[PDB]
Amino acid sequence: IVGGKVCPKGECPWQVLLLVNGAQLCGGTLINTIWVVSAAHCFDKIKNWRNLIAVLGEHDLSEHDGDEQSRRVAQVIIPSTYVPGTTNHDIALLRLHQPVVLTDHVVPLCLPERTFSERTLAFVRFSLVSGWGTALELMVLNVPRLMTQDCLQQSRKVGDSPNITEYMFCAGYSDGSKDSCKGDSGGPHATHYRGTWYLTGIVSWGQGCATVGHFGVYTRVSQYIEWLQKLMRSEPRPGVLLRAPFP
Amino acid sequence: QLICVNENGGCEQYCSDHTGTKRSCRCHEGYSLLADGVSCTPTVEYPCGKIPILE
Ligand SMILES: COc1cc([C@@H](Nc2ccc(C(=N)N)cc2)C(=O)N[C@H](C(=O)O)c2ccccc2)ccc1OCc1ccccc1
Numbered sequence A: 001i002v003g004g005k006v007c008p009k010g011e012c013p014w015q016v017l018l019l020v021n022g023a024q025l026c027g028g029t030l031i032n033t034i035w036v037v038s039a040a041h042c043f044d045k046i047k048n049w050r051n052l053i054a055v056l057g058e059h060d061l062s063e064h065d066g067d068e069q070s071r072r073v074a075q076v077i078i079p080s081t082y083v084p085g086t087t088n089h090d091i092a093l094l095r096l097h098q099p100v101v102l103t104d105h106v107v108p109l110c111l112p113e114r115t116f117s118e119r120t121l122a123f124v125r126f127s128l129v130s131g132w133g134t135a136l137e138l139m140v141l142n143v144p145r146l147m148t149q150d151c152l153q154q155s156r157k158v159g160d161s162p163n164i165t166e167y168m169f170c171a172g173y174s175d176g177s178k179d180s181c182k183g184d185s186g187g188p189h190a191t192h193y194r195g196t197w198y199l200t201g202i203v204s205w206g207q208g209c210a211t212v213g214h215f216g217v218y219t220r221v222s223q224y225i226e227w228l229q230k231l232m233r234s235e236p237r238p239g240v241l242l243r244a245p246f247p
Numbered sequence B: 001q002l003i004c005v006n007e008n009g010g011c012e013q014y015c016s017d018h019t020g021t022k023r024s025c026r027c028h029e030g031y032s033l034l035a036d037g038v039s040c041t042p043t044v045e046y047p048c049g050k051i052p053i054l055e
């Protein structure tokens, strides 16, 4: 997270750290005791599918303070319309092997109703993004959401570029000072509305980190609520990677 | 007036429109509606989207 403050331990309890064989892979989002929402692109390289770990209650990656809870990833579900090398449909649903125990430090983020999100959450000006990118603390940030037509108009044009699609949205700053970044991939874009926080976006992609005249592009979760709710009731499967169809 | 399109219908969490009658409010998993028919309340110890230490 470029230009952000530290998220005071406890104030971001839905944050997930994803490990493969100890190596830092991505950030994720907790939505209930058993399911995690991260970016599909985090799993492009993955060879050793059986060594994935989701870490929760994590704050400082340099000291185990006890609150940390680690669970094996039993499953990675991805839409059939996501294809590596293309930024679209950048969302992944992750089942855990055994549930996590909810504490003062491990709380799920609300997953809103499609309509509620599109009608209300889409127009909350600012939302917090977070991620890790001696003292390796969780970093948070307050980005303003922009609708696609503005985002394009405010963005600096390039010859070769992906469209911002109906499954993306731009939040952030043009002046080159504040932005989420590659290491935050899959992390929450959390939106407060009247006393409760809701997941609205996933750190998806951007043009570098905090480059002038560029915004961070996020996966538009409102598109996937029915797709996620349905899959969370689905029976456990053999194998880790599942490519569920979208829609 | 009393419609979800107007300011989430005055509802705290979820809002529901019906064709002939006034909008109704609702709540998220682990929350339930209060006597004002707009506000929600946790029916669990750790409802989603609430930060424990900040309350
Ligand atoms: C998913 O996708 C992506 C991602 C990326 C990043 N992220 C981000 C950035 C920025 C941001 C802001 N600013 N906010 C956020 C996030 C990242 O993550 N990166 C990484 C590396 O490089 O390694 C990757 C990529 C791809 C896949 C996998 C992985 C970057 C980039 C991209 O994309 C681009 C493209 C692709 C394809 C086609 C076109 C374009």
Ligand SMILES: [Ca+2]
Binding pocket: A058, A059, A060, A061, A062, A063, A064, A065, A068
């Ligand atoms: Ca720690």
